[PDB]
Amino acid sequence: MQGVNIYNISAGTSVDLAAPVTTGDIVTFFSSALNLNAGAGNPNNTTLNLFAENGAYLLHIAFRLQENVIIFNSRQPDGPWLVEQRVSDVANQFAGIDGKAMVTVFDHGDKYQVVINEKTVIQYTKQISGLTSSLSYNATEETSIFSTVVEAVTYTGLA
Amino acid sequence: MQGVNIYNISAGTSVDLAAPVTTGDIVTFFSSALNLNAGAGNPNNTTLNLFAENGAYLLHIAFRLQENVIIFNSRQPDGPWLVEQRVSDVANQFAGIDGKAMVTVFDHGDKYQVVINEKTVIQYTKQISGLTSSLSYNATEETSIFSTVVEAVTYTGLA
Ligand SMILES: OC[C@H]1O[C@@H](O[C@H]2[C@H](O)[C@@H](O)[C@H](O)O[C@@H]2CO)[C@H](O)[C@@H](O)[C@H]1O
Ligand SMILES: OC[C@H]1O[C@@H](O[C@H]2[C@H](O)[C@@H](O)[C@H](O)O[C@@H]2CO)[C@H](O)[C@@H](O)[C@H]1O
């Protein structure tokens, strides 16, 4: 049974998925803006996260304009941040598309494939496994590189 | 490989896919507008098409405001239109979201699952088989129910 769910996530909020995302599923965050000249984050301008039921950060995608890097990481609910994987030059990863952008995450079971628009920037080996039951779009309106509200679409029941 | 391809389709035009759509793959048409009171179609207000390389209409989705129906059909390169499938009440299929719309098509091998926003509108049994190599969005800026430019996003290599 394949299904499409739509969530309108306001900057700085988490949302519970009606249909969990598991291996073979896809989630795409759509932003109606691209602000590569936003303020400084603490230290993230924007972070996109996939959470496990217990609150673990299965996948943490951090966009840093100042440190000019996209960080990928995970962490147990009450644990320290784990081993960071990085992709330098935020602007360049969004090159080609202006005033809008999208971030797609493919759950491949043992890894998460993250695509920025059409560019796959990383095949992130998972540090924590499990299904994703909630998502969050973290940022302040003034420092986020994305629009105030990001539309998240999940394609589930794919495998 | 699994990948994302983004296309900007202007009303009355088509695009060649960078990665063909086959069984297991997904395609979503995004409209930044939704006018369910445009004029009457001629007879179509808006059509979204999945084409095979030879020109066959693997899947033709036509919205007709005056007939208040959404038609699904197929057609060979130089053959007649095949058996029409219809689903009444256009507005109801879009109920829930206004000012915009989303049409997703899952290629399930023997059928195309068509979902409008989060609602599955039809499990269309294929009348023609094959890989989708091109897409089109046909309408006039005058009577289309969608925005003048429709964004198509494909998720391929999923199988
Ligand atoms: O790993 C994601 C996590 O990073 C934190 O900052 C890290 C910093 O990236 C690292 O280089 C340094 O050694 O440790 C810092 C944490 O003490 C961010 O603060 C956090 O929000 C996440 O983005
Ligand atoms: O099937 C899609 C195809 O329909 C054509 O119109 C049909 C009409 O819908 C049907 O009721 C009638 O019996 O036959 C017509 C074709 O001769 C449209 O003209 C065409 O553009 C497609 O939308």
mmCIF file of all heavy atoms in Angstrom, chain A residues 9-31:
data_model
loop_
_atom_site.group_PDB
_atom_site.id
_atom_site.type_symbol
_atom_site.label_atom_id
_atom_site.label_comp_id
_atom_site.label_asym_id
_atom_site.label_seq_id
_atom_site.Cartn_x
_atom_site.Cartn_y
_atom_site.Cartn_z
ATOM 1 N N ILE A 9 5.351 22.286 7.624
ATOM 2 C CA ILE A 9 6.150 22.545 8.813
ATOM 3 C C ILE A 9 6.627 23.986 8.970
ATOM 4 O O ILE A 9 7.413 24.485 8.162
ATOM 5 C CB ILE A 9 7.391 21.629 8.840
ATOM 6 C CG1 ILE A 9 6.996 20.186 8.508
ATOM 7 C CG2 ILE A 9 8.047 21.690 10.209
ATOM 8 C CD1 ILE A 9 8.176 19.217 8.486
ATOM 9 N N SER A 10 6.157 24.655 10.017
ATOM 10 C CA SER A 10 6.578 26.028 10.269
ATOM 11 C C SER A 10 7.980 26.038 10.859
ATOM 12 O O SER A 10 8.352 25.150 11.634
ATOM 13 C CB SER A 10 5.604 26.717 11.222
ATOM 14 O OG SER A 10 4.338 26.867 10.604
ATOM 15 N N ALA A 11 8.767 27.039 10.478
ATOM 16 C CA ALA A 11 10.132 27.161 10.972
ATOM 17 C C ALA A 11 10.183 27.003 12.481
ATOM 18 O O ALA A 11 9.477 27.698 13.215
ATOM 19 C CB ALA A 11 10.717 28.506 10.577
ATOM 20 N N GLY A 12 11.019 26.072 12.930
ATOM 21 C CA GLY A 12 11.182 25.825 14.350
ATOM 22 C C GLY A 12 10.179 24.884 14.994
ATOM 23 O O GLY A 12 9.913 25.008 16.187
ATOM 24 N N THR A 13 9.620 23.944 14.236
ATOM 25 C CA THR A 13 8.657 23.008 14.821
ATOM 26 C C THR A 13 8.870 21.571 14.374
ATOM 27 O O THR A 13 9.490 21.311 13.344
ATOM 28 C CB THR A 13 7.194 23.370 14.468
ATOM 29 O OG1 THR A 13 6.990 23.221 13.056
ATOM 30 C CG2 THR A 13 6.876 24.803 14.883
ATOM 31 N N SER A 14 8.348 20.641 15.170
ATOM 32 C CA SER A 14 8.422 19.224 14.857
ATOM 33 C C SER A 14 7.011 18.816 14.452
ATOM 34 O O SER A 14 6.045 19.513 14.775
ATOM 35 C CB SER A 14 8.863 18.412 16.080
ATOM 36 O OG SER A 14 10.221 18.660 16.404
ATOM 37 N N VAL A 15 6.894 17.710 13.729
ATOM 38 C CA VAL A 15 5.590 17.226 13.304
ATOM 39 C C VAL A 15 5.601 15.708 13.293
ATOM 40 O O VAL A 15 6.594 15.090 12.891
ATOM 41 C CB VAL A 15 5.229 17.744 11.890
ATOM 42 C CG1 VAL A 15 6.190 17.165 10.855
ATOM 43 C CG2 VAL A 15 3.807 17.379 11.555
ATOM 44 N N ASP A 16 4.505 15.103 13.740
ATOM 45 C CA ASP A 16 4.421 13.648 13.760
ATOM 46 C C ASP A 16 3.860 13.139 12.441
ATOM 47 O O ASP A 16 2.881 13.679 11.916
ATOM 48 C CB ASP A 16 3.551 13.171 14.922
ATOM 49 C CG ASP A 16 4.043 13.682 16.255
ATOM 50 O OD1 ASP A 16 5.272 13.845 16.399
ATOM 51 O OD2 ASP A 16 3.207 13.911 17.153
ATOM 52 N N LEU A 17 4.503 12.113 11.893
ATOM 53 C CA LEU A 17 4.069 11.535 10.629
ATOM 54 C C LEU A 17 2.919 10.562 10.864
ATOM 55 O O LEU A 17 2.929 9.811 11.841
ATOM 56 C CB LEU A 17 5.231 10.792 9.966
ATOM 57 C CG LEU A 17 6.498 11.602 9.694
ATOM 58 C CD1 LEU A 17 7.558 10.693 9.088
ATOM 59 C CD2 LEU A 17 6.181 12.758 8.756
ATOM 60 N N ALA A 18 1.929 10.584 9.972
ATOM 61 C CA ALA A 18 0.785 9.681 10.073
ATOM 62 C C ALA A 18 1.257 8.296 9.652
ATOM 63 O O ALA A 18 0.870 7.283 10.233
ATOM 64 C CB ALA A 18 -0.341 10.147 9.161
ATOM 65 N N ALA A 19 2.099 8.273 8.627
ATOM 66 C CA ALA A 19 2.656 7.038 8.104
ATOM 67 C C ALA A 19 4.165 7.136 8.279
ATOM 68 O O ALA A 19 4.824 7.979 7.662
ATOM 69 C CB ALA A 19 2.298 6.883 6.631
ATOM 70 N N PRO A 20 4.734 6.280 9.138
ATOM 71 C CA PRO A 20 6.178 6.305 9.372
ATOM 72 C C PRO A 20 6.976 6.084 8.099
ATOM 73 O O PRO A 20 6.480 5.481 7.138
ATOM 74 C CB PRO A 20 6.378 5.172 10.376
ATOM 75 C CG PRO A 20 5.302 4.202 9.989
ATOM 76 C CD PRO A 20 4.116 5.122 9.809
ATOM 77 N N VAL A 21 8.203 6.596 8.088
ATOM 78 C CA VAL A 21 9.089 6.409 6.950
ATOM 79 C C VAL A 21 10.070 5.313 7.325
ATOM 80 O O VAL A 21 10.741 5.387 8.355
ATOM 81 C CB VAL A 21 9.863 7.689 6.595
ATOM 82 C CG1 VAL A 21 10.992 7.361 5.639
ATOM 83 C CG2 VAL A 21 8.927 8.692 5.948
ATOM 84 N N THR A 22 10.131 4.285 6.490
ATOM 85 C CA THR A 22 11.010 3.162 6.734
ATOM 86 C C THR A 22 11.830 2.900 5.476
ATOM 87 O O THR A 22 11.776 3.674 4.516
ATOM 88 C CB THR A 22 10.201 1.899 7.093
ATOM 89 O OG1 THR A 22 11.090 0.878 7.563
ATOM 90 C CG2 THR A 22 9.446 1.390 5.874
ATOM 91 N N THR A 23 12.591 1.811 5.485
ATOM 92 C CA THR A 23 13.443 1.456 4.352
ATOM 93 C C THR A 23 12.676 1.410 3.032
ATOM 94 O O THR A 23 11.656 0.732 2.924
ATOM 95 C CB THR A 23 14.112 0.095 4.591
ATOM 96 O OG1 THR A 23 14.823 0.135 5.833
ATOM 97 C CG2 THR A 23 15.078 -0.230 3.467
ATOM 98 N N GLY A 24 13.175 2.134 2.036
ATOM 99 C CA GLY A 24 12.533 2.170 0.733
ATOM 100 C C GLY A 24 11.636 3.383 0.545
ATOM 101 O O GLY A 24 11.141 3.640 -0.557
ATOM 102 N N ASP A 25 11.435 4.138 1.617
ATOM 103 C CA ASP A 25 10.578 5.312 1.572
ATOM 104 C C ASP A 25 11.370 6.568 1.281
ATOM 105 O O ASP A 25 12.601 6.591 1.386
ATOM 106 C CB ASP A 25 9.822 5.468 2.889
ATOM 107 C CG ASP A 25 8.768 4.386 3.094
ATOM 108 O OD1 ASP A 25 8.352 3.740 2.106
ATOM 109 O OD2 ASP A 25 8.351 4.188 4.253
ATOM 110 N N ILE A 26 10.646 7.623 0.939
ATOM 111 C CA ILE A 26 11.261 8.890 0.590
ATOM 112 C C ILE A 26 10.559 10.064 1.247
ATOM 113 O O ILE A 26 9.336 10.062 1.404
ATOM 114 C CB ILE A 26 11.208 9.101 -0.937
ATOM 115 C CG1 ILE A 26 11.947 7.957 -1.639
ATOM 116 C CG2 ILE A 26 11.806 10.456 -1.305
ATOM 117 C CD1 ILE A 26 11.802 7.963 -3.142
ATOM 118 N N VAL A 27 11.346 11.058 1.643
ATOM 119 C CA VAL A 27 10.798 12.269 2.220
ATOM 120 C C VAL A 27 11.509 13.429 1.543
ATOM 121 O O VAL A 27 12.733 13.430 1.399
ATOM 122 C CB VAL A 27 10.997 12.348 3.760
ATOM 123 C CG1 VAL A 27 12.471 12.298 4.119
ATOM 124 C CG2 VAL A 27 10.370 13.625 4.286
ATOM 125 N N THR A 28 10.729 14.397 1.083
ATOM 126 C CA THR A 28 11.290 15.565 0.432
ATOM 127 C C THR A 28 10.763 16.825 1.095
ATOM 128 O O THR A 28 9.550 16.981 1.293
ATOM 129 C CB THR A 28 10.934 15.617 -1.066
ATOM 130 O OG1 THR A 28 11.581 14.537 -1.753
ATOM 131 C CG2 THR A 28 11.409 16.933 -1.674
ATOM 132 N N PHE A 29 11.685 17.709 1.456
ATOM 133 C CA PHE A 29 11.324 18.972 2.079
ATOM 134 C C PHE A 29 11.423 19.999 0.972
ATOM 135 O O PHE A 29 12.444 20.073 0.286
ATOM 136 C CB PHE A 29 12.303 19.352 3.192
ATOM 137 C CG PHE A 29 12.371 18.365 4.318
ATOM 138 C CD1 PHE A 29 13.263 17.299 4.273
ATOM 139 C CD2 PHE A 29 11.565 18.520 5.444
ATOM 140 C CE1 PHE A 29 13.359 16.404 5.337
ATOM 141 C CE2 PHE A 29 11.652 17.627 6.513
ATOM 142 C CZ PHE A 29 12.552 16.568 6.456
ATOM 143 N N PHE A 30 10.351 20.764 0.786
ATOM 144 C CA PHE A 30 10.314 21.797 -0.234
ATOM 145 C C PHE A 30 10.285 23.173 0.417
ATOM 146 O O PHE A 30 9.481 23.431 1.321
ATOM 147 C CB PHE A 30 9.074 21.647 -1.127
ATOM 148 C CG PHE A 30 9.021 20.354 -1.906
ATOM 149 C CD1 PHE A 30 8.417 19.223 -1.368
ATOM 150 C CD2 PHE A 30 9.548 20.282 -3.195
ATOM 151 C CE1 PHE A 30 8.331 18.031 -2.108
ATOM 152 C CE2 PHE A 30 9.470 19.103 -3.942
ATOM 153 C CZ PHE A 30 8.858 17.973 -3.397
ATOM 154 N N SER A 31 11.171 24.049 -0.046
ATOM 155 C CA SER A 31 11.238 25.416 0.448
ATOM 156 C C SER A 31 10.914 26.347 -0.713
ATOM 157 O O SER A 31 11.387 26.144 -1.834
ATOM 158 C CB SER A 31 12.632 25.741 0.974
ATOM 159 O OG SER A 31 12.743 27.127 1.258
#
